Design a protein around this ligand. Structure first.
Ligand SMILES: CCCCCCCCCCCCCCCCCC(=O)OC[C@H](COP(=O)([O-])OCC(O)COP(=O)([O-])OC[C@@H](COC(=O)CCCCCCCCCCCCCCCCC)OC(=O)CCCCCCCCCCCCCCCCC)OC(=O)CCCCCCCCCCCCCCCCC
Ligand SMILES: CCCCCCCCCCCCCCCCCC(=O)OC[C@H](COP(=O)([O-])OCC(O)COP(=O)([O-])OC[C@@H](COC(=O)CCCCCCCCCCCCCCCCC)OC(=O)CCCCCCCCCCCCCCCCC)OC(=O)CCCCCCCCCCCCCCCCC
Lengths: 54, 74
């Protein structure tokens, strides 16, 4: 009997806010400022060498 | 040069509002900027054009006088 089960059709989509995006988030937080910050300073500059540059 | 720079800096503010349009428009914490950004923009435009317009008037007054006074002296 369990094998005979089926699945209902779910809703197509929920509400899509016309003024919020992943790159331009509507509300503010320090998390998004952190993403923009580490994109500016770039990722950790990992050295492949065995001795320091200086 | 001064009028062109101050016009580009004003255009820069319009980009800042356009680049952040969704926040200035939908977030109520930024309503005061949405409401008063254009008033400041007009007051800035007015200063830019006022100075250019006044300078233009004076240059034309100066040019028409030296021509008239010169012919009298001739
Ligand atoms: C027409 C011809 C003219 C042009 C000719 C061309 C010449 C152009 C010159 C370019 C030279 C090549 C450039 C190479 C890279 C930059 C130089 C460098 O050393 O980088 C490697 C050096 C470390 O080498 P590393 O092995 O790759 O790093 C391994 C570790 O990650 C590091 O950390 P660690 O702790 O894990 O490991 C040990 C660490 C231990 O030591 C340290 O970590 C140093 C600690 C410093 C950080 C402490 C906090 C202070 C910083 C706060 C930030 C303030 C600035 C920002 C805020 C204002 C916004 C602008 O490093 C060391 O081993 C000793 C330090 C290196 C020797 C001492 C160098 C002192 C001067 C360097 C700083 C410049 C000061 C300003 C001078 C300029 C005056 C206007 O990087 C730095 O520490 C900072 C670099 C920033 C330098 C900016 C200035 C560039 C101009 C360089 C000219 C030479 C200096 C002239 C000053 C003379 C004063 C005595
Ligand atoms: C060491 C040498 C020194 C050289 C000095 C020069 C240094 C470089 C300068 C760089 C800054 C200037 C940028 C020049 C363009 C460079 C191309 C570029 O953007 O990089 C590649 C850039 C991609 O960036 P990516 O680095 O590859 O990756 C970005 C990530 O994906 C993330 O995507 P994202 O979209 O979020 O990234 C945005 C990205 C790129 O954002 C952009 O979309 C670039 C567009 C920036 C427009 C600048 C304002 C100009 C307003 C229009 C004036 C038009 C006048 C003529 C009108 C004729 C028609 C009547 O970054 C920026 O937003 C740059 C903004 C720079 C700061 C501007 C602050 C202004 C206030 C301070 C004023 C100071 C006085 C000077 C102001 C001068 C103003 C003339 O390419 C594009 O974005 C393609 C855009 C395609 C659609 C554009 C549609 C037109 C948009 C116009 C906006 C209209 C605003 C409202 C109207 C205002 C007029 C009344």
């Amino acid at each position: 009997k369990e094998n005979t089960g089926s699945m209902k059709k779910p809703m197509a989509k929920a509400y899509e806010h016309p003024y919020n995006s992943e790159h331009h988030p509507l509300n503010f937080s320090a998390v998004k400022i952190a993403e923009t910050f580490h994109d500016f300073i770039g990722p950790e500059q990992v050295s492949p060498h065995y001795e320091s540059f200086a | 040069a001064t009028a062109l720079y101050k016009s580009s800096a004003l255009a820069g503010n319009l980009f800042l509002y356009a680049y952040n349009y969704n926040n200035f428009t939908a977030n109520i914490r930024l309503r005061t900027m949405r409401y008063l950004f254009p008033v400041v923009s007009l007051a800035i435009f007015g200063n830019i054009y006022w100075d250019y317009r006044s300078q233009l008037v004076k240059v034309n007054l100066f040019d028409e006088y030296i021509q008239a006074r010169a012919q009298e002296l001739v």
